[PDB]
Design a protein around this ligand. Structure first.
Ligand SMILES: [Mg+2]
Lengths: 82, 82
């Protein structure tokens, strides 16, 4: 079964603390891991949030976009085969 | 040790035609394949260019950044464990 990684992209608008919040809320990240991934996205432009089956990855991507827009942030989230 | 995927990230400055050029030249993509990946960059924010050993991935990333900046484009190219 081929799994899929969920990615978040950097942007200049979305607050760092919201990205940490998203990682903790939707990707079961510890505070430390969420902070490191957020910083990785900031530094490298993209970061890996988790790995799931195709349909679950689709769900996570959707949940992040929904949350982000309702929080008034343009945060971009997508997926790739892992 | 894993192989490593080379990624190109979207930005609001780099011409589509230059992204296609980079994919053709540095990642040996056919015109259609280069176009396909470029459109993924545009719509999803990131596209996969190729998968290589670590040192070769580093080389590709470097060659893309070198080419991009000399052509006055801010195109970001990075790598992740595949
Ligand atoms: Mg893999």
């Amino acid at each position: 079964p081929s799994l899929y990684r969920v990615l978040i992209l950097n942007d200049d608008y979305t607050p760092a603390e919201f990205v940490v919040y998203v990682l903790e809320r939707f990707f079961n990240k510890s505070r430390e891991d969420a902070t490191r991934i957020m910083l990785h996205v900031h530094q490298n432009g993209v970061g890996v949030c988790g790995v799931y089956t195709y349909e679950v990855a689709e769900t996570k991507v959707a949940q992040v976009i929904d949350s982000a827009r309702r929080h008034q942030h343009p945060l971009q989230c997508t997926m790739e085969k892992d």
